[PDB]
Amino acid sequence: KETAAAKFERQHMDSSTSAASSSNYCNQMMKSRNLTKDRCKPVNTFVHESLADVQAVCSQKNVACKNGQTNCYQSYSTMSITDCRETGSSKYPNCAYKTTQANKHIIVACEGNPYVPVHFDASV
Ligand SMILES: O=c1ccn([C@@H]2O[C@H](COP(=O)(O)O)[C@@H](O)[C@H]2O)c(=O)[nH]1
C-alpha cells in the first residue's frame, strides 16, 4: 500500500541526483514514477534534496496553499528542483515533458502525525 507521505516521496522526491539528469529526465521520471498512467499530468516537480530536508519544511514558514487551505509551508532555503511541464505536442497516451532546473523555495502541504509533506503545492 502507499501512505500519503510515500505518495509524496514517489511523486516528488529525487534525492539521488542534485539536479535533472538530462534532456529526457522528465519523460523518463514521469514514466518511471507512474505519474502518466491514465492521463498526462500537466506539471510535476521533483525535489533534489534529502528527504529529511524536505520533511523539515513542515516546521518552517506557514503560508496559504494555492487552494487557500492553511496547512502549507514554505522552505526557508531554496532547494534544487526540476519542474516537468507538458509540451504542446503532449497528448495522452504520448505524454512529453520539458525539463526545467531551478533553485527555488518550495511550498508543501503537510498532514498527519508525524506531520509530513503530502502534496507539492508550488515553488517561489
Ligand atoms: O509547481 C508545481 C505545481 C503543481 N504541481 C503538481 O500539480 C498538482 C496541481 O497543480 P495545479 O493545480 O497548481 O495546476 C499538484 O497537486 C502537484 O502534484 C507540482 O508538482 N509543481
CATH number at residue 30: 3.10.130.10
Hey, what's the cell of 61? 514558514
Q: How far apart are CA 95 and CA 11, in angstroms?
A: 16
Q: Which amino acid is at 34?
A: N
Domain residues for the domain of 30 are 1-124
Q: How far apart are CA 106 and CA 16, in angstroms?
A: 18
**Ligand 1 in contact with 10 (CB < 6 A)?**
no
**Of these residues, 12, 33, 48, 105, which one is catalytic?**
12
**Of these residues, 119, 120, 121, 123, which one is catalytic?**
119
Q: How far apart are CA 96 and CA 24, in angstroms?
A: 9
Angle CA 69–73–77, to nearest 5 = 155
Q: How far apart are CA 96 and CA 2, in angstroms?
A: 26
Q: Which of 82, 75, 23, 83 lies closest to 52, judged by CA?
A: 75
Helix ranges, the chain (H): 4-12, 25-32, 51-55
Testing ligand 1's pocket by substitution, the residue of 103, 120, 124 carrying the most ligand atoms inside 8 A of its CB is: 120
- Give distance in angstroms: CA of 37 to centre of ligand 1: 17
Task: Give me the number of domains the chain comprises.
Answer: 1
Q: How far apart are CA 21 and CA 17, in angstroms?
A: 7
**Ligand 1 in contact with 82 (CB < 6 A)?**
no
User: CB pairs under 8 A, 24+ apart, for 32-38?
Assistant: 34/10, 35/11, 36/92, 36/95, 38/92
